[PDB]
Write a protein that binds this ligand. Sequence first.
Ligand SMILES: Nc1ncnc2c1ncn2[C@@H]1O[C@H](COP(=O)(O)OP(=O)(O)O)[C@@H](O)[C@H]1O
Length: 280
Amino acid sequence: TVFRQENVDDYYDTGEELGSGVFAVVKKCREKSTGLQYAAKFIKKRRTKSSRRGVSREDIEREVSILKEIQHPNVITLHEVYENKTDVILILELVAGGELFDFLAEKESLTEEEATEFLKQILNGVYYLHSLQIAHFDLKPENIMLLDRNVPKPRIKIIDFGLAHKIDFGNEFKNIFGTPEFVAPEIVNYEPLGLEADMWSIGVITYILLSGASPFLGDTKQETLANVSAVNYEFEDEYFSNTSALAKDFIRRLLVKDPKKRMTIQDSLQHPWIKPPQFE
Ligand SMILES: Nc1ncnc2c1ncn2[C@@H]1O[C@H](COP(=O)(O)OP(=O)(O)O)[C@@H](O)[C@H]1O
């Protein structure tokens, strides 16, 4: 699939850098014709078939194809795509209130209500995605943006569809590995993956939202991964003594090794608490 090959600079001005990744950089931008602001994600292309630098065209096209499908308040909207010899440039909906990661770092500790207010939105977005048989495969606080961080109940959007896949056969078996702290045991063990992996990541996010601590994090990536595969986590009293037992129950039902026994996204919304790279 080919994208618009006019110079993006003929149509957009860029400003502040919003984020920086292995082979992607995201910059705030403004469309000249409308004055509307976006986030321009510049993804470096591979220079040769066998190269390890840059992103394969297959992987870029998958991200674009998934983004084109989605429209929901809790996920990002793709506006346009450009390309040139070096980059594919995705013009994405701007989410201007920063990462959930940075919000948590600045506050140090959420109430159980503040955590659920974030969680409920994450769950609604993932319910949408999973309804479409889209697994995100990279859910973590760095990939959840706030629209406006200066309101008591910030609204969020899921970003970074660089690992997302359509799961039309219930599982997929490709090269898929996210951030060690957040990946499910089946990722660690190189097993077939499905929508269930996202539910594990949600459990890890929930634990972090409530405690400020990461359930499986070791001092090295290998230690983190070994902890994940062994389901080596516990609820520290220092962090959870004033957290409800129902909140712990919710996490326990997500941090389950066997993906078949883990809560699904529909289960998570009906749960009584809610119901109203890898190498060193
Ligand atoms: N739509 C957006 N609005 C604002 N910031 C974004 C947006 N998309 C990405 N970012 C920022 O850029 C960072 C890297 O995102 P991204 O490039 O999508 O990840 P990757 O390069 O791993 O695919 C994010 O963690 C975030 O800080």
